[PDB]
Design a protein around this ligand. Structure first.
Ligand SMILES: [Mg+2]
Length: 209
């Protein structure tokens, strides 16, 4: 059966001097000059995708999942990562399956992952961003797969910037708005029909938990 996911919201630096003051020139070159292009199957508008924060965001997600895999001992663990342009900050919603990391040790593991990112990406610089590495709480919150079509998939540009997944049902949806639209409607249709079945059900122990 499909597992539960932890959510880690990571704020992404989108302004060099204000968020990463004194960061090395090689970081500066990397972020300033790296080009992005949408895949052939994408229907998104590249003109709305901020590439420099995207460049950092890609490495953050990349390095997080590497460290998550090590720490969880789950090499092909399921994830859905979505890069957003929020009201105040660019941020990533990192959904990763709970497998291998019991809730009790999640926080300690995340701190280990947090220091790795600081060391590997920001060269020791603590980024000047408020609460930039936070796990969603209620204790540690566990969402099921439904969080993706409910809250992440319906996002459009420019709020939606980019997305990564190893989850096979969301591959084409990552950078295709039409596919996202289809999956949201499909999920909501299933939810609606599930609601209807509940009302119409005449079987014993129909006691709402
Ligand atoms: Mg958001």
């Amino acid at each position: 059966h499909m597992p539960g996911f932890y959510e880690i919201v990571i704020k992404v630096p989108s302004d060099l001097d204000g968020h990463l003051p004194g960061i090395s020139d090689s970081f500066v070159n990397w972020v300033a000059e790296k080009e992005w292009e949408l895949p052939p199957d994408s229907d998104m508008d590249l003109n709305l995708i901020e590439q420099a924060p995207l460049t950092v965001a890609e490495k953050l997600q990349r390095d997080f999942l590497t460290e998550w895999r090590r720490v969880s001992k789950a090499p092909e663990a399921l994830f859905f990562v979505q890069f957003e342009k929020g009201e105040s900050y660019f941020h990533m919603h990192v959904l990763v399956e709970t497998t291998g990391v019991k809730s009790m040790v999640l926080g300690r593991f995340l701190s280990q992952i947090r220091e790795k990112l600081i060391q590997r990406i920001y060269r020791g610089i603590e980024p000047t961003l408020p609460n930039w590495f936070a796990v969603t709480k209620t204790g540690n919150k566990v969402v099921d797969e439904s969080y993706i079509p409910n809250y992440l998939l319906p996002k459009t540009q420019p709020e939606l910037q980019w997305a990564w997944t190893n989850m096979e049902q969301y591959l084409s949806a990552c950078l295709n708005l039409t596919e996202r639209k289809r999956l949201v409607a499909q999920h909501l249709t299933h939810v609606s029909q599930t609601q209807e079945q509940n009302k119409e059900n005449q079987n014993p122990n129909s006691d709402a938990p």
